Design an enzyme around this catalytic site. Sequence first.
Site, PDB file in Angstrom:
ATOM      1  N   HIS A  13      -4.488   1.466 113.085  1.00 30.36           N
ATOM      2  CA  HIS A  13      -4.022   0.374 112.247  1.00 30.36           C
ATOM      3  C   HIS A  13      -4.559   0.528 110.831  1.00 30.36           C
ATOM      4  O   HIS A  13      -5.606   1.140 110.606  1.00 30.36           O
ATOM      5  CB  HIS A  13      -4.444  -0.976 112.825  1.00 30.36           C
ATOM      6  N   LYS A  24     -12.344  -5.639 124.345  1.00 33.40           N
ATOM      7  CA  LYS A  24     -13.399  -5.791 125.346  1.00 33.40           C
ATOM      8  C   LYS A  24     -14.704  -5.208 124.826  1.00 33.40           C
ATOM      9  O   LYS A  24     -14.910  -3.983 124.897  1.00 33.40           O
ATOM     10  CB  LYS A  24     -12.993  -5.124 126.659  1.00 33.40           C
ATOM     11  N   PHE A  56      -5.550   6.251 107.403  1.00 31.13           N
ATOM     12  CA  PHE A  56      -4.489   6.913 108.149  1.00 31.13           C
ATOM     13  C   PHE A  56      -4.071   5.989 109.284  1.00 31.13           C
ATOM     14  O   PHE A  56      -4.922   5.527 110.052  1.00 31.13           O
ATOM     15  CB  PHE A  56      -4.960   8.258 108.708  1.00 31.13           C
ATOM     16  N   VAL A  90     -15.273   1.742  94.978  1.00 30.03           N
ATOM     17  CA  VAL A  90     -15.018   1.984  96.391  1.00 30.03           C
ATOM     18  C   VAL A  90     -13.607   2.534  96.518  1.00 30.03           C
ATOM     19  O   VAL A  90     -12.648   1.901  96.062  1.00 30.03           O
ATOM     20  CB  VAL A  90     -15.182   0.714  97.241  1.00 30.03           C
ATOM     21  N   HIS A 109     -10.177  -5.575 109.897  1.00 31.89           N
ATOM     22  CA  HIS A 109      -9.099  -6.501 109.577  1.00 31.89           C
ATOM     23  C   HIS A 109      -9.582  -7.830 109.008  1.00 31.89           C
ATOM     24  O   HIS A 109      -8.773  -8.564 108.432  1.00 31.89           O
ATOM     25  CB  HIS A 109      -8.246  -6.771 110.821  1.00 31.89           C
TER      26      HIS A 109
HETATM   27 NA    NA Z   1      -6.512   3.555 109.686  1.00 30.39          NA
HETATM   28 NA    NA Z   2     -10.775   0.657  95.387  1.00 34.49          NA
HETATM   29 ZN   LIG Z   3      -6.697  -0.717 115.507  1.00 35.82          ZN
END
Ligand code: NA
Ligand code: NA
Ligand SMILES: [Zn+2]
Lengths: 8, 374
Positions: free
Chosen positions: B178, B31, B198, B193, B141
């Site tokens: 996630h 949301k 976690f 990078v 993601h």
């Molecule tokens: Na994470």
């Molecule tokens: Na990397």
């Molecule tokens: Zn998440």
Amino acid sequence: XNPEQXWG
Amino acid sequence: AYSQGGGKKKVCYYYDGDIGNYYYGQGHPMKPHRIRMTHNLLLNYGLYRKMEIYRPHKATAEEMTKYHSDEYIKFLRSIRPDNMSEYSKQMQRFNVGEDCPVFDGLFEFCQLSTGGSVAGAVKLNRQQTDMAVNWAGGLHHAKKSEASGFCYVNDIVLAILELLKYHQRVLYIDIDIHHGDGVEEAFYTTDRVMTVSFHKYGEYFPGTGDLRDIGAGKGKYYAVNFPMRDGIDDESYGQIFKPIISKVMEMYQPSAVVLQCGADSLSGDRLGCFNLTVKGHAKCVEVVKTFNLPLLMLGGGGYTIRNVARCWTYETAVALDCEIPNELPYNDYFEYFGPDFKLHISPSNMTNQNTPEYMEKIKQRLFENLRMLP
Ligand code: NA
Ligand code: NA
Ligand SMILES: [Zn+2]
């Protein structure tokens, strides 16, 4: 992600 | 030469008033209204008097194609609820239509989310701020040519690519419950990078983030994953977060940091199974802030929106080094925060399946991988 729907 | 890395930091904050009107659909956990709740709450706290507030631009397709493919971006510009039937095959190959549905203004939402992250990175590159805050960003993601986990355009990867124009090494830290798969995948084979995530692992989205995933090629040992179980609390989380990040800062020594502050790792989240409070979550911002590096703070997960507004309001105050009272001031969403109307939350009685020996064992194995850096 959503346990209520699908696999994610 | 007299600098000691202390003092209050200059914070720039990005927000577009139209972000709260985008609607994922009936029953969808994501949301964007939670971002407006956050903004209105920190306004009524008076935090606007301590930071500069900017309205981000709409990121163009050229800016998005710095990482994403031309075909995937062109699809995002064209797909609409009124022409989904014509794009039935394209919706499947780009993973749009289920977890990541089509809704009105989908591309504009991606522009506002991404615009805040890239503008924050530009502001950091120009050395015009110490921290840049974009709670509409953090969509970790999104893949190069497909959507995933409510995310369409990966603003983090684009913002990090912007930081790589002037910073040799960039550190990415992901405290969303996630795994930050989209960010880790984009920089899996480079040492410029370092991604540290976690997350809850084991029969959980997205299914990646194993302890043994450490990077490939020149990026080997530059991907850190801390798999966790259900019910971790503030004491167990803080017991490993500060020493892990401290060792990463020592070995990797980045010149810029990107912190994804996903709120779905809080106690009581609609999709999360952790047991963190706002203070335990915000403790991660305190640790990263101490190192005095160009820091980009982003949003992400969070699906109990009253706690998301609490978490990101307090973490903005933490970034400003401003103490705010626990009694919430009146705001446009005061009823959302009942029945206590307090800023901080209490953990649940759920069991912490992360034993102290488990946390110490995972931390020790990560220290072995961190020793492999130059
Ligand atoms: Na994470
Ligand atoms: Na990397
Ligand atoms: Zn998440």
